[PDB]
Design a protein around this nucleic acid. Sequence first.
RNA 1: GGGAUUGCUGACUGAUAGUGCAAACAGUACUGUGAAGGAACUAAUGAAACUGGGCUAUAAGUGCGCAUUCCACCAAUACGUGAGCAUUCGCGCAUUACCAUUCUCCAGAGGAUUUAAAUGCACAAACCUAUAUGCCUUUUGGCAUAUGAUUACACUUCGUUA
Lengths: 120, 79, 559, 205, 128
Amino acid sequence: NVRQLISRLIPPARKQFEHLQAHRRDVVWGDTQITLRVRQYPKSKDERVSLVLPNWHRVRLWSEALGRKVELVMTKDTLRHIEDMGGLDAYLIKTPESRLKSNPASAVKWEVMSALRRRE
Amino acid sequence: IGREAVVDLIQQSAAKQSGIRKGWQVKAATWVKRVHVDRGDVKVGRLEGGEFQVLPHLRPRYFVPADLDKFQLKPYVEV
Amino acid sequence: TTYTQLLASIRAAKSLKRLEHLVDTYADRFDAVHVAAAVARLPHLLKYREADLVDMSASAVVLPSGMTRTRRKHGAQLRSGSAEVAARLAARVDAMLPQHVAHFFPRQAACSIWAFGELRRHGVIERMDSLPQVLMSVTRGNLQPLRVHAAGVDFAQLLHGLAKLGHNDEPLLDALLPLVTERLGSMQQRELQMTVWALATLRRATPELLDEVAQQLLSTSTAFLLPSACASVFWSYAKTEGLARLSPRRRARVAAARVKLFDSLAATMMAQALLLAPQDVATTLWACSVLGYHHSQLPAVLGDAVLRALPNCSDAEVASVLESLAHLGYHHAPLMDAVAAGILAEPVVSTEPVNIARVLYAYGVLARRGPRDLQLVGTLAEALVRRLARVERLDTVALACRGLGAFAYDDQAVLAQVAARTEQLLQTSTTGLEQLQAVLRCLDAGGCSYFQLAVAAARMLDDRLRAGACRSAPLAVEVLYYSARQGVXXXXXXXXXXXXXXXXXXXXXXXXXXXXXXXXXXXXXXXXXXXXXXXXXXXXXXXXXXXXXXXXXXXXXXX
Amino acid sequence: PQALYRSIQPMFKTNRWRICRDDLVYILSGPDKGKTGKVLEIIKDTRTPQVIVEGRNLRKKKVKTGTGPDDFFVVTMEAPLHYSQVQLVDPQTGKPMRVIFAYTADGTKVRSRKVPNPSTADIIATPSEEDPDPRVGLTGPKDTSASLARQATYTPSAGFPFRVRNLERIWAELQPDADXXXXXXXXXXXXXXXXXXXXXXXXXX
Amino acid sequence: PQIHAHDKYKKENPQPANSFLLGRFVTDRNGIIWHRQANYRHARHAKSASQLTRLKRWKPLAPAFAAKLRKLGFSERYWAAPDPQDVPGFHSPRGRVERPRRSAVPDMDHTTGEPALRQSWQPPNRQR
RNA sequence: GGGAUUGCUGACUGAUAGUGCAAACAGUACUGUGAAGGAACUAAUGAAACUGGGCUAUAAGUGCGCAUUCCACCAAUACGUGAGCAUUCGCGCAUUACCAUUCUCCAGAGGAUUUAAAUGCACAAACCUAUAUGCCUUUUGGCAUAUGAUUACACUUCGUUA
Ligand SMILES: [Mg+2]
Ligand SMILES: [Mg+2]
Ligand SMILES: [Mg+2]
Ligand SMILES: [Mg+2]
Ligand SMILES: [Mg+2]
């Protein structure tokens, strides 16, 4: 039914969905999941599909691997995940390259690996 | 969808119906008397104070052979 | 946008055109491992044109962890666009190769050589001798003492790549030792079978066989293999030892050192049925024919396997399987019945002439004397004699004549053109004389009129005597006997005297000389005329042939 | 005949013509059958082939001198018969006969008499179809003979990179520096070399 | 091999369910369509004993209505379909029995459902 | 699903039909600022309306051109080319001549009817382009697991020498 409910989107939710489809690979997507809010009216013949908009913050994480801070856009729950499994270094090492659906996470991942390898 | 791809398809479509300018091309040929179209000339200089200066190295030079008189090859071969 | 993303997008390209785009638009954006990943993903993305034969209906579990669900048809060709894009991309990769070869380890070079060997196998590039040397240097300089660089898998992949590439290398003499150093430590069973296949097709390593037998036997079973790998192991031991045993195949036997491994392989291949291909069982049956290995219920299972796919088999595979079940003496009645019905329902029954000769021999030396087999041997004989226009060898005619002489083939109009083509090819470089002796045995299985090559066979045998570089076997007097009994020239007694003076043959060949002693110039010179009288061979017409040389032998030949 | 022309399937897939030009033929059908003639020209059309014979299918042609009204002259002319309407006359009984394409020795194909012994004396000779030779009427001015036109003048032995083959002539060295035997003096006269020379001479005087 | 079987140009247009006829009527062996009498579900206090006894009986449909239902294709032999399960030896592999799903019977709209219950077809409301 | 060759494919159409177009130049002339709309026209024959005058007042032959099958040269494995109306109740094209005798309304205008044929229409045949279990499918994809985020590994082996 989901392929139907995407086609039943109100124009603000549809424009927000197009922007989500454009700028997904620009921000960190650790455990982030987009969601539709379809509300069910009991006096029937009305199913209004919308979007549950994610919340975004520009947190400045300190990398304990290489001596700098990086700024990068995240959600609350992926910040929970990163700061509750060990930090940016442990996340960028132990989450390999495909659960990262993100470009700056991949770039800082390569910089952590290269700087750490030259640090050996 | 790109700009160059559309222009190339337009030129390939215009490759057909080509030759001696029939149809709409007869009226469209008169655009050269309406919008100052630049022809296929080679530029020989540039304006500095509004006076044109021909650069002498861009003047036309034709490397004609030493003698084309009593040269033993003609434009026609005998059958 | 980064380099690990480029590596992972090369690895998960899922189409060869996508990989072509990534290689072409990011030429300066590469490094060593990007090129290595591109070469690794090259042979996996080739596609074939509609001749993909499904195996989902044959094995209930679809993959044993790695296979293609549709294997191929024998003789299938690639898609034309995919072949063009793959060849252009491989030329692009060979262009981008030496700028990044310097930072390689033995792993990347091993995978590159193996993958380009796969591309040569598929027919993409077929040459590869543009730049193969810098890869050899980067995998050989850092593996001279088995140094800190990688090992184990890379030896098998490098040697498999050189197996598929050939090239007649120099580091075989260097890599003789680190290969045999490291079987028993860091090689799996598939690595062992690729390495023994590569040593087989380079014909290089004979002391490496029995330790590899012991190593892959001390592994928990051979059941961690899959049936084409078992077929390659049989083929490897065939091409490395069976030609040694046969040349210092119905008389071929095994040696006791390798039979336990051969039984382990046969038990594995009968355990892993529902997974086995016609080419695999063709090579397995041929290797068991060559090695002289006669297992119980193994050819029954392999004949059942080719019975289960007989509309899907090309006639080369069927002819190979029927030869390997004819040389190794075995009867498979459903397979013979199905093959006979299949090419008796076929209205225009032509194929390659060697396949006709192979089916003729297979039905000849096996107990198929039913009416359907007589109709089949007549049909195959007519379809072959319609196409004796080959200048290859008399060997195809030799198998055809062995099949026609095992039967009592008496159809004269076939045998006339068979004899005409035999004498037409006989003036050229005929390799052997038994290849003519089979034709003579066929042409005297039934009645024939073949003087025009009987004189030529006499000329060839006198030429072999004048050469003085032949066997002078009892088959020499067997060549003498047929042309002697049909022809009468008188110069043929020199061979029958000189070879019989150095005889090395006791019975059933001096009777041939005694029966041929009327047409030749030898009147009566035989100490063995009484020894054959004490032997009573009773194969030739010696009773009517001893009526002019030894009257006691005339009674001894028939009574 | 049919008036469509393009609906007709094109005949003569293998190009072989039993009737040739300049030969005696018998008219089989039409306003004059039983008469004979000599073929003047065969119109080899794959869809509608015609044959024009000598003075048989005569119809008046209204040749139109260009004019709006009735100003024209009329000339009798042989109308084209269909190719199928005619057949070759054998020289023995004067009746029409079928020509076959028999092969004689040397691999050549000739036109025989349709007999079970097709050999010499049954071959009908076919004349050549071309005689436009400009070889007679050659050697006019502005022409070159074939032997002169086939000279092997070109050789790749020379033409190698020669950046210093200048010889230092004002612009006759510019062409062999850009990669040339002799420029005409008139060509160098076109790019005037005397504008600065006159100013130099006037300053000197 | 000019075998032309026109797979396209076959639409398989949907036919109406007529689900409102399932539990109300039933067909007998002779072909007669029977139904239970109405006016018996509630308000039984305001009715006489003979009237309530009379309304418990079933009556056949009138011939005109029965003819329309028979032509429409109504052939229901049972009030509700007997479950293929509940037969001994024919039971669910993992379900202890199954979930029944009691069914409702309202369906009437002039745009989409039940063309039998509307005189004409109403066009939709502006489609957003 | 899509894009081009072939159809001894068509109880498809035959010029107001069939594509919008069978045509020297049809997505043309022309219309519109523009996006966009969008014609007519084959070759003969020459119906009616209309308007003047007059009046009344022998299901056959014969030629060509091919296709089928025979033959003899063949790449020698599907036919490869070539003599032959040799063969076929084959196909296409070409061709078949009457000679009076006046009691027929005539002249124009117009382009219907009749005849002819796919380059039109619909498909068909090869050709090229585009992971497994089960739920819902509905000319096909959404959902958990497994060889799995990994730059690495099995297979098309031609065998023939009693
Ligand atoms: Mg039309
Ligand atoms: Mg019209
Ligand atoms: Mg229309
Ligand atoms: Mg007309
Ligand atoms: Mg009229």
